[PDB]
Amino acid sequence: TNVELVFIPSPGLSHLVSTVEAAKLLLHRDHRLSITVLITNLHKDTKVENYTLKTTSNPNTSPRLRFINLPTQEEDSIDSQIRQVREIVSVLIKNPDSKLGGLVLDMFCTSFIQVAEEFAIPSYVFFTSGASALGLLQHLVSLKLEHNQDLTQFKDSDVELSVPCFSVPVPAKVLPAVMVEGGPIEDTFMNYFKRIPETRGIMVNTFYELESFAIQSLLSDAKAPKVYPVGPILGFDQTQGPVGDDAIKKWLDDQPENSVVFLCFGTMGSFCEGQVKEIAMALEKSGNRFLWSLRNYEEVLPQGFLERTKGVGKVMGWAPQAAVLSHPAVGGFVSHCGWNSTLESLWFGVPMATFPLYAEQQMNAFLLVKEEGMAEMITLDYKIDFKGEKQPEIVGSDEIEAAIRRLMAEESGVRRKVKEMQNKARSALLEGGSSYDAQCLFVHDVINNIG
Ligand SMILES: O=c1ccn([C@@H]2O[C@H](COP(=O)(O)OP(=O)(O)O)[C@@H](O)[C@H]2O)c(=O)[nH]1
């Protein structure tokens, strides 16, 4: 009667954490369910070792959560990756005390639908982003595949698109750049997302009160896999607290409440020397207390920037993002609009200033600013990747300073919507919330679809 689920996340510590935290919640919804996560490069990344070890070694983690390593070599393309999953799956169905409920794949792991079809087990997809991204990606896929459209026509275009999962026209400049590029880049990602509608169910990392209009549009197509908004899935306990820092907590305790603006740009926010100097100049002219996570310093910052901003701000490298946003001193967040960073800032009621860089962050910035109105914008169409030997585009310090001033105001319609949306996010995870029911409905359908 026991049902085992196999999760296949994309390589990296990030996508693994969201898979583990989501698995920990689904296990609490049915004691008959077990989850086995396939790790792409366990014995190669020491950060993935620590996370997998500290999770399995913890007595509070469920005993029904197993981590199995995928011994991927260097030359294995999609050919050999399929077999090493097919090998483990064939070993896992030999257990007569468990029924394989199916494969739950990542957005970049939809190639293993082949394996699920060979073993006559269902296929599922865990979308680590929001519903507005899913509907947009399927709209762009249907445009090229079903309407015979050259998606490069929207590249650097001032036109707007009528996307079904959006209540406002979506500018072509906020589209995911990899979908309007063409050639090998577009082909790689189109083969990733076009196989999603061929699954049984799609788990989305969002809640209904956030991206309503998109979820209704995704569910309207009955000829499509049912979507389960199980978010927000965050990279900490979501009930105890994230790991912090003493010297960090020391300085923020001295500043007033909602007075420090935090600046972080994810794990790939490598600006050029010019853009960093514009951010530092804007922080100087704003006069606001700031905490800047910057990835030497006196050679990349304006002359005397640290000297003039000594008692008002602090600059550093890597930052405990979730812990900093939880501090009462942080009242602003200049973010790259990553979905995890967006959900973290929403979980702690911190309003955001959009500085999107890569991936779907351009659409996430458009979603929060124009669609929902719960974020001030610095830019919506900024792209960090400069092609050829061309000079990178740069956002001026005046545009950054203006958005910080609007963000750190005592009262604003953005700050009120964020505080209101923060409670709607925390209620969605409590029993009876929208995402709680979605988790229970998902685990219910996984067991019922097996016969
Ligand atoms: O200095 C940093 C930068 C990032 N993060 C974490 O890295 C992720 C960044 O968010 P997201 O994955 O949406 O952005 P991306 O990694 O794609 O840039 C989140 O889990 C953050 O908590 C962090 O802890 N400290």
Short mmCIF file of C-alpha atoms and ligand atoms in Angstrom, two decimals:
data_model
loop_
_atom_site.label_atom_id
_atom_site.label_comp_id
_atom_site.label_asym_id
_atom_site.label_seq_id
_atom_site.Cartn_x
_atom_site.Cartn_y
_atom_site.Cartn_z
CA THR A 1 0.00 0.00 0.00
CA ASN A 2 3.07 2.21 0.34
CA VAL A 3 3.68 4.53 -2.63
CA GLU A 4 7.19 5.74 -3.47
CA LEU A 5 7.84 8.92 -5.45
CA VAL A 6 11.08 9.60 -7.34
CA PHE A 7 12.20 13.22 -7.74
CA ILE A 8 14.76 14.18 -10.39
CA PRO A 9 15.90 17.80 -9.89
CA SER A 10 18.26 19.69 -12.15
CA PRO A 11 21.93 19.74 -11.10
CA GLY A 12 22.85 22.25 -8.41
CA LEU A 13 22.29 22.89 -4.73
CA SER A 14 19.53 25.44 -5.40
CA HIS A 15 17.02 23.24 -7.25
CA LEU A 16 17.73 20.42 -4.79
CA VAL A 17 16.74 22.47 -1.72
CA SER A 18 13.36 23.38 -3.21
CA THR A 19 12.83 19.71 -4.08
CA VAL A 20 13.71 18.55 -0.55
CA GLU A 21 11.59 21.18 1.22
CA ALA A 22 8.61 20.40 -1.02
CA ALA A 23 9.11 16.68 -0.39
CA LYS A 24 9.17 17.24 3.38
CA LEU A 25 5.74 18.89 3.17
CA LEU A 26 4.17 16.25 0.92
CA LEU A 27 5.33 13.48 3.27
CA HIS A 28 3.35 15.14 6.08
CA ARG A 29 0.13 14.87 4.05
CA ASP A 30 0.02 11.06 3.75
CA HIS A 31 1.94 8.51 5.82
CA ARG A 32 1.69 6.07 2.88
CA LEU A 33 3.95 8.23 0.68
CA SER A 34 7.72 7.91 0.36
CA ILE A 35 10.08 10.08 -1.69
CA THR A 36 13.47 9.20 -3.19
CA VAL A 37 15.52 12.06 -4.67
CA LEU A 38 18.04 11.36 -7.43
CA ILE A 39 21.18 13.50 -7.05
CA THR A 40 23.00 14.35 -10.28
CA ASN A 41 26.45 15.17 -8.84
CA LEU A 42 26.53 14.10 -5.20
CA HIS A 43 30.18 13.05 -4.89
CA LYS A 44 31.40 16.05 -6.95
CA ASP A 45 29.98 19.15 -5.20
CA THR A 46 30.91 19.44 -1.52
CA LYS A 47 27.94 21.76 -0.94
CA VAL A 48 25.51 19.08 -2.10
CA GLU A 49 27.25 16.56 0.17
CA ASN A 50 26.76 18.77 3.23
CA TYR A 51 23.08 19.37 2.46
CA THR A 52 22.27 15.72 1.74
CA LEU A 53 24.29 14.55 4.75
CA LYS A 54 22.85 17.09 7.20
CA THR A 55 19.34 16.23 5.98
CA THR A 56 19.62 12.44 6.30
CA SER A 57 21.61 12.69 9.55
CA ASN A 58 18.97 14.91 11.17
CA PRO A 59 16.62 12.89 13.44
CA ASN A 60 13.76 15.31 12.72
CA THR A 61 13.72 14.57 8.98
CA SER A 62 11.27 11.89 7.93
CA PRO A 63 12.67 8.35 7.50
CA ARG A 64 10.72 8.14 4.22
CA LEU A 65 13.08 10.63 2.52
CA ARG A 66 15.92 8.87 0.68
CA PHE A 67 18.74 10.38 -1.39
CA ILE A 68 20.16 8.20 -4.17
CA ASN A 69 23.16 9.33 -6.21
CA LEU A 70 23.24 9.49 -10.00
CA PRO A 71 26.83 8.59 -11.00
CA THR A 72 26.93 10.93 -14.00
CA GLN A 73 30.28 11.01 -15.81
CA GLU A 74 31.59 13.81 -18.04
CA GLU A 75 30.76 12.42 -21.50
CA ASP A 76 27.19 11.29 -20.75
CA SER A 77 24.74 13.24 -22.88
CA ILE A 78 20.99 12.63 -22.64
CA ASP A 79 21.73 9.10 -23.88
CA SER A 80 23.53 7.75 -20.80
CA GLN A 81 21.65 9.91 -18.28
CA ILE A 82 18.44 8.10 -19.22
CA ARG A 83 19.98 4.67 -18.61
CA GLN A 84 21.35 5.44 -15.15
CA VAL A 85 17.84 6.52 -14.17
CA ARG A 86 16.35 3.48 -15.92
CA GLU A 87 18.81 1.30 -13.99
CA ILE A 88 17.82 2.74 -10.61
CA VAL A 89 14.09 2.71 -11.44
CA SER A 90 14.33 -0.97 -12.38
CA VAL A 91 16.03 -1.61 -9.03
CA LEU A 92 13.36 0.39 -7.18
CA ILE A 93 10.31 -1.45 -8.57
CA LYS A 94 11.80 -4.79 -7.48
CA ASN A 95 10.54 -3.92 -3.99
CA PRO A 96 7.17 -5.65 -3.39
CA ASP A 97 6.58 -3.48 -0.28
CA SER A 98 6.27 -0.28 -2.35
CA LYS A 99 4.53 0.91 -5.51
CA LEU A 100 6.34 3.47 -7.67
CA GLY A 101 3.86 6.34 -7.91
CA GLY A 102 5.81 7.94 -10.75
CA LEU A 103 8.59 10.39 -11.59
CA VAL A 104 8.48 14.05 -10.53
CA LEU A 105 10.81 15.90 -12.89
CA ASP A 106 12.28 19.39 -13.07
CA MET A 107 11.67 21.88 -15.86
CA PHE A 108 15.13 20.95 -17.18
CA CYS A 109 14.62 17.22 -16.48
CA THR A 110 11.58 16.49 -18.69
CA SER A 111 13.71 14.12 -20.79
CA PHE A 112 13.05 11.33 -18.27
CA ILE A 113 9.41 11.06 -19.36
CA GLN A 114 10.85 8.33 -21.60
CA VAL A 115 11.89 6.34 -18.53
CA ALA A 116 8.48 6.76 -16.89
CA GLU A 117 6.76 5.57 -20.07
CA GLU A 118 8.96 2.47 -20.33
CA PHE A 119 8.04 1.33 -16.80
CA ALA A 120 4.33 2.27 -17.16
CA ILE A 121 4.53 4.76 -14.28
CA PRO A 122 3.06 8.30 -14.36
CA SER A 123 5.16 11.40 -15.01
CA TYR A 124 5.00 14.64 -13.01
CA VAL A 125 6.73 18.02 -13.19
CA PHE A 126 7.77 20.32 -10.32
CA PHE A 127 7.91 23.86 -11.70
CA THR A 128 10.25 25.75 -9.36
CA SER A 129 8.99 29.12 -10.67
CA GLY A 130 5.54 30.72 -10.72
CA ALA A 131 2.40 30.11 -12.74
CA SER A 132 2.88 33.24 -14.86
CA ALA A 133 6.16 31.75 -16.08
CA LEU A 134 4.53 28.41 -16.90
CA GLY A 135 1.70 29.96 -18.91
CA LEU A 136 4.11 32.27 -20.72
CA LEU A 137 6.50 29.45 -21.63
CA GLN A 138 3.60 27.34 -22.92
CA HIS A 139 2.27 30.35 -24.85
CA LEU A 140 5.66 30.87 -26.50
CA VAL A 141 5.94 27.13 -27.18
CA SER A 142 2.50 27.01 -28.81
CA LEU A 143 3.37 30.10 -30.86
CA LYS A 144 6.37 28.38 -32.46
CA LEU A 145 5.07 24.80 -32.59
CA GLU A 146 1.34 25.26 -33.23
CA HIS A 147 1.32 28.64 -35.02
CA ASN A 148 4.63 28.43 -36.96
CA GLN A 149 6.12 31.62 -35.54
CA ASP A 150 9.73 32.85 -35.54
CA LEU A 151 10.05 33.84 -31.89
CA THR A 152 13.08 36.02 -32.73
CA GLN A 153 10.58 38.63 -33.97
CA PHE A 154 10.02 39.65 -30.33
CA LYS A 155 13.77 40.04 -29.68
CA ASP A 156 14.45 43.66 -28.64
CA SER A 157 10.95 44.67 -29.77
CA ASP A 158 8.76 47.44 -28.36
CA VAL A 159 5.60 45.43 -29.16
CA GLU A 160 3.36 43.80 -26.55
CA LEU A 161 1.98 40.26 -26.45
CA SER A 162 -1.48 39.02 -25.48
CA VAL A 163 -0.48 36.19 -23.13
CA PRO A 164 -3.47 34.27 -21.70
CA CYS A 165 -2.02 34.00 -18.17
CA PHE A 166 -1.60 37.80 -17.91
CA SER A 167 -4.24 40.47 -17.32
CA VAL A 168 -2.02 43.17 -18.86
CA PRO A 169 -0.13 43.13 -22.19
CA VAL A 170 3.28 41.51 -21.75
CA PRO A 171 6.07 43.55 -23.38
CA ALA A 172 8.42 41.61 -25.62
CA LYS A 173 11.37 43.12 -23.72
CA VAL A 174 10.42 41.29 -20.50
CA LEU A 175 10.15 37.92 -22.24
CA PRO A 176 12.69 35.25 -21.20
CA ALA A 177 15.65 35.97 -23.45
CA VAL A 178 16.37 32.30 -24.18
CA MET A 179 12.94 31.88 -25.82
CA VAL A 180 13.31 34.74 -28.35
CA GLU A 181 16.98 34.18 -29.25
CA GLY A 182 16.72 31.40 -31.84
CA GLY A 183 19.19 28.77 -32.95
CA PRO A 184 20.75 26.30 -30.51
CA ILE A 185 19.73 28.23 -27.39
CA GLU A 186 16.02 28.43 -28.24
CA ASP A 187 15.98 24.83 -29.50
CA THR A 188 17.47 23.50 -26.25
CA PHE A 189 14.87 25.24 -24.07
CA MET A 190 11.94 24.51 -26.39
CA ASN A 191 12.68 20.79 -26.06
CA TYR A 192 12.61 21.28 -22.28
CA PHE A 193 9.22 23.00 -21.97
CA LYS A 194 7.25 21.43 -24.84
CA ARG A 195 7.24 18.06 -23.04
CA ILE A 196 5.56 19.49 -19.91
CA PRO A 197 1.95 19.27 -21.23
CA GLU A 198 2.57 15.52 -21.77
CA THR A 199 2.67 14.79 -18.02
CA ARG A 200 -0.05 14.00 -15.47
CA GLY A 201 0.36 16.95 -13.10
CA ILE A 202 2.46 20.07 -12.64
CA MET A 203 3.55 21.26 -9.19
CA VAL A 204 4.11 25.03 -9.16
CA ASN A 205 6.03 27.02 -6.54
CA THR A 206 3.39 29.68 -5.91
CA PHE A 207 0.13 30.27 -4.06
CA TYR A 208 -3.29 31.05 -5.50
CA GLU A 209 -3.62 34.50 -3.92
CA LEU A 210 -0.39 35.60 -5.62
CA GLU A 211 -0.78 34.56 -9.27
CA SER A 212 -4.54 34.11 -9.41
CA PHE A 213 -5.26 35.11 -13.03
CA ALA A 214 -2.54 32.76 -14.31
CA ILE A 215 -3.70 29.72 -12.33
CA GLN A 216 -7.29 30.12 -13.55
CA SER A 217 -6.00 30.34 -17.12
CA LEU A 218 -3.81 27.25 -16.69
CA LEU A 219 -6.72 25.29 -15.18
CA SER A 220 -9.18 26.47 -17.86
CA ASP A 221 -7.53 24.21 -20.45
CA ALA A 222 -8.98 20.84 -19.44
CA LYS A 223 -6.81 19.32 -22.20
CA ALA A 224 -3.74 20.02 -20.06
CA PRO A 225 -2.13 18.65 -16.88
CA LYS A 226 -3.70 19.95 -13.69
CA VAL A 227 -1.54 22.50 -11.85
CA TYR A 228 -1.00 22.30 -8.08
CA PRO A 229 0.12 25.60 -6.49
CA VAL A 230 2.09 24.21 -3.53
CA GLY A 231 4.13 27.34 -2.79
CA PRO A 232 5.78 29.15 -1.36
CA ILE A 233 8.53 26.54 -1.00
CA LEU A 234 11.43 28.27 0.76
CA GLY A 235 14.96 27.12 1.50
CA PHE A 236 14.63 26.95 5.28
CA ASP A 237 12.43 25.36 7.94
CA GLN A 238 9.54 27.79 7.20
CA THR A 239 8.58 27.22 10.86
CA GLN A 240 11.81 27.49 12.91
CA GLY A 241 14.07 29.97 11.13
CA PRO A 242 16.95 30.40 8.70
CA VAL A 243 20.62 30.39 9.63
CA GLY A 244 21.98 33.85 10.38
CA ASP A 245 25.19 35.64 11.35
CA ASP A 246 26.26 37.28 14.60
CA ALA A 247 28.25 40.22 13.22
CA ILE A 248 25.39 40.70 10.75
CA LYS A 249 22.74 40.69 13.50
CA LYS A 250 24.93 43.07 15.52
CA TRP A 251 24.89 45.98 13.08
CA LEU A 252 21.25 45.60 12.02
CA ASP A 253 20.11 45.61 15.66
CA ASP A 254 21.41 49.18 16.00
CA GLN A 255 19.54 50.59 12.99
CA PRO A 256 15.87 51.59 13.29
CA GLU A 257 13.01 49.45 12.03
CA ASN A 258 12.45 49.41 8.26
CA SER A 259 15.48 51.66 7.76
CA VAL A 260 18.05 49.40 6.04
CA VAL A 261 17.74 48.60 2.33
CA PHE A 262 19.27 45.22 1.52
CA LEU A 263 20.95 44.66 -1.85
CA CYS A 264 21.56 41.15 -3.21
CA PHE A 265 21.71 39.82 -6.77
CA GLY A 266 21.66 36.05 -6.42
CA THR A 267 24.42 33.62 -7.32
CA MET A 268 25.01 35.01 -10.84
CA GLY A 269 24.76 38.78 -10.37
CA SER A 270 28.23 39.64 -11.70
CA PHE A 271 27.93 43.26 -12.76
CA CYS A 272 30.64 45.12 -14.65
CA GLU A 273 32.76 47.81 -13.00
CA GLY A 274 30.48 50.53 -14.37
CA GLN A 275 27.18 49.21 -13.00
CA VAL A 276 28.64 48.70 -9.52
CA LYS A 277 29.80 52.33 -9.38
CA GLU A 278 26.32 53.50 -10.38
CA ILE A 279 24.74 51.48 -7.57
CA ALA A 280 27.20 52.86 -5.01
CA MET A 281 26.63 56.43 -6.19
CA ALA A 282 22.85 55.97 -5.93
CA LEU A 283 23.22 54.59 -2.40
CA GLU A 284 25.25 57.69 -1.49
CA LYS A 285 22.75 60.17 -2.95
CA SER A 286 19.83 58.30 -1.39
CA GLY A 287 21.23 58.74 2.13
CA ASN A 288 19.47 55.55 3.22
CA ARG A 289 21.02 52.94 5.47
CA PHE A 290 22.06 50.02 3.30
CA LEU A 291 23.52 46.52 3.45
CA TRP A 292 25.18 45.57 0.17
CA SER A 293 26.05 41.98 -0.75
CA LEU A 294 28.67 42.51 -3.47
CA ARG A 295 30.51 39.76 -5.34
CA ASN A 296 39.25 45.02 -4.57
CA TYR A 297 36.33 47.01 -3.17
CA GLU A 298 38.07 50.40 -3.20
CA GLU A 299 39.13 49.55 -6.78
CA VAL A 300 35.55 48.76 -7.89
CA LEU A 301 33.71 51.41 -5.88
CA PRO A 302 33.92 55.21 -6.24
CA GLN A 303 36.69 57.10 -4.49
CA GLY A 304 36.02 57.30 -0.77
CA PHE A 305 32.70 55.47 -0.96
CA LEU A 306 33.40 53.35 2.13
CA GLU A 307 34.80 56.36 4.00
CA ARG A 308 31.80 58.64 3.45
CA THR A 309 29.35 55.76 4.09
CA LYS A 310 30.83 54.29 7.27
CA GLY A 311 28.15 54.81 9.92
CA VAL A 312 25.22 54.53 7.52
CA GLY A 313 25.98 51.40 5.48
CA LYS A 314 28.04 48.23 5.25
CA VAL A 315 29.42 46.41 2.20
CA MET A 316 30.30 42.71 2.18
CA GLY A 317 30.29 39.57 0.03
CA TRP A 318 27.95 36.61 0.35
CA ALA A 319 24.93 37.23 2.58
CA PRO A 320 22.45 35.03 4.46
CA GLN A 321 19.52 36.26 2.39
CA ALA A 322 16.55 34.76 4.24
CA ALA A 323 17.99 35.68 7.64
CA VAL A 324 18.71 39.29 6.64
CA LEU A 325 15.23 39.84 5.19
CA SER A 326 13.78 38.52 8.46
CA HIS A 327 15.58 41.16 10.53
CA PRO A 328 13.19 43.98 11.56
CA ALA A 329 15.72 46.59 10.41
CA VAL A 330 15.44 45.59 6.73
CA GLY A 331 12.59 47.51 5.12
CA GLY A 332 13.74 47.29 1.51
CA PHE A 333 15.23 44.79 -0.90
CA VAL A 334 16.92 45.67 -4.19
CA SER A 335 16.74 42.25 -5.83
CA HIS A 336 17.49 40.55 -9.13
CA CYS A 337 13.87 39.26 -8.96
CA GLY A 338 14.74 35.59 -8.63
CA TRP A 339 11.62 33.65 -7.68
CA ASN A 340 13.17 32.22 -4.51
CA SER A 341 14.41 35.69 -3.55
CA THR A 342 11.00 37.09 -4.47
CA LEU A 343 9.21 34.55 -2.27
CA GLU A 344 11.67 35.03 0.60
CA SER A 345 11.18 38.80 0.57
CA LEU A 346 7.42 38.26 0.37
CA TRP A 347 7.52 35.78 3.27
CA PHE A 348 9.06 38.49 5.47
CA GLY A 349 6.99 41.39 4.13
CA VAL A 350 9.96 43.25 2.61
CA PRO A 351 9.10 45.30 -0.51
CA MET A 352 11.34 44.90 -3.53
CA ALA A 353 13.10 47.14 -6.04
CA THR A 354 13.43 45.27 -9.33
CA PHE A 355 16.81 44.82 -11.03
CA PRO A 356 16.27 41.73 -13.19
CA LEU A 357 19.26 40.11 -14.88
CA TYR A 358 18.85 36.66 -16.45
CA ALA A 359 16.28 33.84 -16.77
CA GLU A 360 12.61 34.77 -16.22
CA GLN A 361 13.55 37.58 -13.80
CA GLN A 362 12.49 40.13 -16.43
CA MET A 363 8.97 38.70 -16.30
CA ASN A 364 9.00 38.38 -12.50
CA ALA A 365 9.85 42.08 -12.29
CA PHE A 366 7.02 42.88 -14.70
CA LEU A 367 4.69 40.62 -12.69
CA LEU A 368 5.31 42.33 -9.35
CA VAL A 369 5.47 45.90 -10.69
CA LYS A 370 2.83 46.13 -13.42
CA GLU A 371 0.59 43.09 -12.92
CA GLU A 372 0.25 43.17 -9.11
CA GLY A 373 1.76 46.49 -8.04
CA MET A 374 3.73 45.11 -5.08
CA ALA A 375 7.23 46.31 -6.02
CA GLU A 376 8.96 49.49 -7.12
CA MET A 377 10.90 49.22 -10.36
CA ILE A 378 14.44 50.28 -11.19
CA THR A 379 14.25 48.51 -14.56
CA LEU A 380 12.11 45.83 -16.19
CA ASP A 381 14.02 44.94 -19.39
CA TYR A 382 17.66 45.04 -18.23
CA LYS A 383 19.69 42.07 -19.49
CA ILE A 384 23.07 41.26 -17.97
CA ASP A 385 24.39 39.16 -20.89
CA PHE A 386 26.01 41.44 -23.48
CA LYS A 387 26.53 39.82 -26.88
CA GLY A 388 29.68 39.98 -29.00
CA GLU A 389 32.31 42.61 -28.23
CA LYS A 390 29.65 45.24 -27.46
CA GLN A 391 29.54 47.53 -24.44
CA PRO A 392 27.13 46.47 -21.66
CA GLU A 393 24.09 48.66 -21.09
CA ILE A 394 24.04 50.56 -17.80
CA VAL A 395 21.26 51.85 -15.55
CA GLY A 396 22.04 55.30 -14.21
CA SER A 397 22.38 56.15 -10.54
CA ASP A 398 19.49 58.62 -10.78
CA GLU A 399 17.08 55.86 -11.82
CA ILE A 400 18.36 53.65 -8.99
CA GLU A 401 18.20 56.46 -6.41
CA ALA A 402 14.64 57.36 -7.41
CA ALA A 403 13.40 53.78 -6.97
CA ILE A 404 15.14 53.46 -3.59
CA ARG A 405 13.47 56.66 -2.36
CA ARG A 406 10.07 55.34 -3.44
CA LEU A 407 10.89 52.01 -1.77
CA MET A 408 12.05 53.39 1.59
CA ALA A 409 9.12 55.79 2.01
CA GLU A 410 7.23 55.38 5.27
CA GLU A 411 3.90 54.80 3.50
CA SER A 412 3.37 53.49 -0.03
CA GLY A 413 0.81 51.43 -1.90
CA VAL A 414 3.57 48.95 -2.69
CA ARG A 415 4.53 48.43 0.96
CA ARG A 416 0.88 47.95 1.93
CA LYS A 417 0.26 45.38 -0.81
CA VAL A 418 3.39 43.45 0.21
CA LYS A 419 2.39 43.39 3.88
CA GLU A 420 -1.09 42.23 2.84
CA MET A 421 0.38 39.61 0.50
CA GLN A 422 2.74 38.39 3.23
CA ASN A 423 -0.17 37.20 5.37
CA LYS A 424 -1.83 35.61 2.32
CA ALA A 425 1.41 33.69 1.73
CA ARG A 426 1.73 32.37 5.29
CA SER A 427 -1.96 31.40 5.39
CA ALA A 428 -1.60 29.42 2.15
CA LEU A 429 0.74 26.97 3.91
CA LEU A 430 -1.26 26.54 7.12
CA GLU A 431 -3.83 23.75 7.16
CA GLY A 432 -6.82 24.78 5.08
CA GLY A 433 -4.80 27.18 2.95
CA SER A 434 -4.83 27.04 -0.82
CA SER A 435 -1.39 25.44 -1.11
CA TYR A 436 -2.05 23.03 1.76
CA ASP A 437 -5.07 21.68 -0.13
CA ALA A 438 -3.01 21.58 -3.33
CA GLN A 439 -0.38 19.45 -1.59
CA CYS A 440 -3.05 17.10 -0.24
CA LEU A 441 -4.81 16.97 -3.62
CA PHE A 442 -1.50 16.19 -5.34
CA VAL A 443 -0.54 13.33 -3.01
CA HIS A 444 -4.11 12.06 -3.30
CA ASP A 445 -4.00 12.03 -7.10
CA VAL A 446 -0.55 10.39 -7.16
CA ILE A 447 -1.92 7.38 -5.28
CA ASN A 448 -5.25 7.28 -7.14
CA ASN A 449 -3.67 7.50 -10.61
CA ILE A 450 -1.75 4.27 -9.93
CA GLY A 451 -4.86 2.07 -9.78
O1 LIG B 1 24.10 36.22 -1.11
C1 LIG B 1 23.22 35.38 -1.36
C2 LIG B 1 22.60 35.18 -2.63
C3 LIG B 1 21.65 34.23 -2.78
N1 LIG B 1 21.26 33.43 -1.73
C4 LIG B 1 20.22 32.40 -1.92
O2 LIG B 1 20.26 31.98 -3.27
C5 LIG B 1 18.93 31.99 -3.84
C6 LIG B 1 18.81 33.10 -4.84
O3 LIG B 1 17.46 33.15 -5.35
P1 LIG B 1 17.09 32.56 -6.76
O4 LIG B 1 17.48 31.13 -6.76
O5 LIG B 1 15.64 32.87 -7.13
O6 LIG B 1 18.00 33.37 -7.79
P2 LIG B 1 19.10 32.75 -8.74
O7 LIG B 1 19.89 31.83 -7.81
O8 LIG B 1 18.49 32.06 -9.92
O9 LIG B 1 19.96 33.96 -9.11
C7 LIG B 1 17.98 32.08 -2.64
O10 LIG B 1 17.65 30.80 -2.14
C8 LIG B 1 18.80 32.90 -1.65
O11 LIG B 1 18.42 32.63 -0.30
C9 LIG B 1 21.81 33.56 -0.47
O12 LIG B 1 21.48 32.86 0.48
N2 LIG B 1 22.77 34.54 -0.36
#
